[PDB]
Design a protein around this ligand. Structure first.
Ligand SMILES: O=C(NCc1ccc(S(=O)(=O)c2cc(F)cc(F)c2)cc1)c1ccn2ccnc2c1
Ligand SMILES: O=C(NCc1ccc(S(=O)(=O)c2cc(F)cc(F)c2)cc1)c1ccn2ccnc2c1
Lengths: 471, 470
């Protein structure tokens, strides 16, 4: 079973002895710190952590004993605060005396703004605020995936609109391939759910169950996929029987969309000789609701896509859209699912526009670039203490390193407001109490062991929408 | 609860209809594909996955039903293989008819060798081999962490031996700060355990429980930490009371080692004026077994370390060791726990050597660099099919992309052997049956729902050791 007394950085076990004496409150906030691009971030993932790890009776007699035995051997000493954890057990039946206020999930906030604040509601539990830092900071991950996935959506939207005149199929242009490329099972589900905030296509099944259990949707499932081949299902037929492999597969999925990887031996031979001549008759007869989706999987991403399109364009009836861009027949599409990140995605769609190919022809699949190749310093997600109460007097606290102004932190009690121009501003030093800036957009989502406010996955999707989508 | 029927890439659900008719055997392998850095890898983590996800009754009527309802909505169609999973449920009581062979955990294998293989034991379950590719491939992560952690140990070992003459304290030179920098709780456990294969210092508690549950050690715990301050335990005293904070903290932990972060306002001021003058008397009186460890946490890593060292060198009695390198008094040490990954680690220790500072003075903390900033293409961890049997005839299969020779896969039944010079070789096309390279080095570790071979964390530590240590 999960034990919250063991879900923290080791040194935090010794922190209760290090605060100023007569301290009755510790107030801390979380922010995607601003750096001297990712100028706005999608706040998502907190609700998952609250339900799975923080709510309810998280402290038992046995968990305190287990933690005591582990920490004694871990530190070679008895630094564990048994009294403090016992207090919570007896006074609150193991419920955390903590109040967490947070901006609504799905919200899109510029960098350098408070996203959530954490404080203790019992004077005896001043130490509890930064005890659960580690478990709350890990929300940087669904925030970063959702933010980075959305930024890619922006790029796709821009070029799809310029080359086709609309945004049809936009929410299916970036597919999640990264189930195998992530570090663990829990990570898979979390990351996949963050991607689904912006898109509808995924192969990471783990994210589906997370959303149903923790967020919920009106629709049965939030993510979809289609039948497809991998290299094993093709190579199993033997080197000399790739055509037999291909033919068999498209016949098995004649009435639904089907993707087939064609780069096992020679991507350019398959597209020109096999798809383009030998099995052309099985392709041109397909429905618009069930196209063949050719999948190159190696070589330079831009160069391979262009050459595949160049080949297919000469073997199939190509039309020109109203914007003047070349479009494949509705039964034939291409997916690039190898080596795709936010950087190469820009290079490909930009290169496609150069050669007058519409973005309608292409979908994208991203593995580790979408889910794994992300760190906490990308958005500088940080958790800092800003306000404490010692001897009944509250002081505004902050760090301000001489060698790095970028690591300076906010002072005092914080609040998030709309500016008169409709932008966001974080008020410091409790200045939000002057009520010059309207209502604080931070809401109590957790208090004294209960989840006090919840959002469905539908609300979150609406919040994280693009301006180009609203228009 | 975990459901193995929902623990795979979505398109794999459709693959059973895609193999050639009359396929009775699918045989697949896992390797860190070959491409001057990371020439060898540490095999670790597969045992965790076998015990948590693959062993015992993993199929139930409820799980089959649950998967059926999910996939019908997921594909907007019925493509799920209910009969196949029902066969396993009835015929084997939910145990997976799967044979997995593998190299011992902890083993250091050069790139491009078979690390493990997977094949179905029942003709009816040919599709099962690659169904579990996704859960098995995720072992890239403990492998990559273990490997990148060990490569950092090589660097530290090299420079510690050079500037001190021995390897004392090496297993405590790279500390794990990665708990908050990782993508989840589960990853934190797996990643931290992978680090503990090479070192002993960790702050990620979750790694200890994983080792105890899945590997076990002779000692009560495989990892250790010391009391330390964070930026909140210092700043809470107010900007005008940093000295008050320092004094309170080093007095609470006056007989045990303690680390104090000193860059909240001015790192160079805290070292020169606060540690070096005002509270100097509290430092010089400390036991050697309980040193103060100063921790900067900002600025250029190398520049900050050197300047901090030069300041303390003029405030405290510095000696010179038998190698000619400068050494702080035994009650005073430094830890750099910011911006540390394998590249900057190399830059710092080399920089210290040039300025005649011993590596004995310093230890390193790493967060995302150690546990998060890693992907699957770093060691090119891959899972591919190499052998199938259709119509009672074995076929050696492979991929060979015309545009990428590096993505070429191995052919046929594989085996791992010792060369006459004592190196590793992977034999293809069943050539291991010729018995010209001796015995196969892979062991059977999973058969028909049962873990058939395991390793203690101590044995894994022994196998992973550096040559210089041996
Ligand atoms: O091919 C894979 N999956 C199948 C697949 C096929 C097409 C599309 S699509 O985006 O074209 C698409 C989406 C969709 F929802 C409706 C639709 F009509 C068209 C997406 C996904 C796959 C999965 C994981 N991987 C890991 C490593 N490699 C892979 C490969
Ligand atoms: O300071 C942190 N932890 C405390 C700490 C301090 C010093 C050493 S040590 O390597 O000096 C050491 C090790 C040991 F086992 C014996 C010993 F004597 C000396 C190790 C650990 C810490 C933890 C997580 N973080 C995340 C972000 N930042 C942090 C910081």
């Amino acid at each position: 079973e999960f034990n919250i007394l063991l879900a923290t950085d080791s040194y935090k076990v010794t922190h209760y002895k290090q605060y100023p004496p007569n301290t009755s409150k510790v107030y801390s906030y979380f922010e995607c710190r601003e750096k001297k691009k990712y100028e706005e971030t999608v706040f998502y993932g907190l609700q998952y952590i609250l339900n799975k790890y923080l709510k309810g009776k998280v402290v038992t007699k046995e968990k305190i004993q287990e933690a005591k035995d582990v920490y004694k051997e871990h530190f070679q000493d008895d630094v564990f605060n048994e009294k403090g954890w016992n207090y919570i057990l007896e006074k609150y039946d193991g419920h955390l005396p903590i109040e967490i206020k947070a901006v609504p999930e799905g919200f899109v906030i510029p960098r350098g703004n408070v996203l959530f604040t954490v404080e203790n509601t019992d004077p005896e539990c001043y130490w509890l605020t930064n005890w659960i830092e580690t478990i709350l900071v890990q929300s940087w991950y669904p925030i970063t995936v959702a933010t980075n996935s959305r930024e890619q959506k922006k790029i796709l939207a821009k070029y799809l609109l310029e080359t086709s005149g609309n945004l049809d199929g936009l929410e299916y242009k970036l597919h999640d391939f990264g189930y195998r490329g992530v570090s663990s099972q829990e990570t898979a589900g979390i990351g996949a759910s963050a991607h689904l905030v912006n898109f509808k296509g995924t192969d990471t099944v783990a994210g589906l169950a997370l959303i149903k259990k923790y967020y919920g949707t009106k629709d049965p499932v939030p993510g979809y996929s289609v039948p497809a081949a991998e290299h094993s299902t093709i190579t199993a037929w033997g080197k000399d029987h790739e055509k037999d492999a291909f033919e068999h597969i498209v016949t098995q999925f004649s009435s639904v969309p089907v993707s087939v990887v064609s780069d096992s031996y020679d991507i350019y031979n398959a597209c020109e000789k096999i798809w383009g001549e030998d099995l052309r008759h099985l392709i041109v007869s397909r429905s618009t609701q069930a196209p063949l989706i050719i999948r190159p999987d190696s070589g330079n991403p831009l160069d391979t896509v262009l050459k595949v399109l160049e080949i297919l364009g000469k073997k199939f009836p190509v039309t020109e859209n109203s914007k003047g861009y070349k479009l494949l027949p509705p039964y034939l599409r291409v997916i690039q699912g190898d080596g795709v990140d936010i950087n190469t995605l820009q290079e490909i769609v930009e290169g496609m526009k150069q050669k007058m190919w519409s973005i309608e022809n292409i979908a994208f699949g991203s593995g580790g670039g979408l889910l794994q190749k992300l760190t906490r310093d990308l958005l500088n997600c940080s958790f800092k203490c800003s306000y404490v109460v010692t001897n009944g007097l509250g002081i505004n606290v902050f760090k301000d390193p001489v060698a790095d102004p970028n690591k300076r932190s906010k002072k005092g009690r914080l609040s998030l407001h709309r500016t008169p121009a409709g932008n966001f501003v974080t008020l410091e030093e409790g200045k939000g109490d002057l009520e010059e800036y309207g209502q604080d957009l931070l809401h109590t989502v957790f208090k004294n062991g209960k989840v006090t406010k919840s959002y469905s996955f539908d609300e979150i999707r609406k919040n994280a929408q693009l301006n180009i989508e609203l228009e």
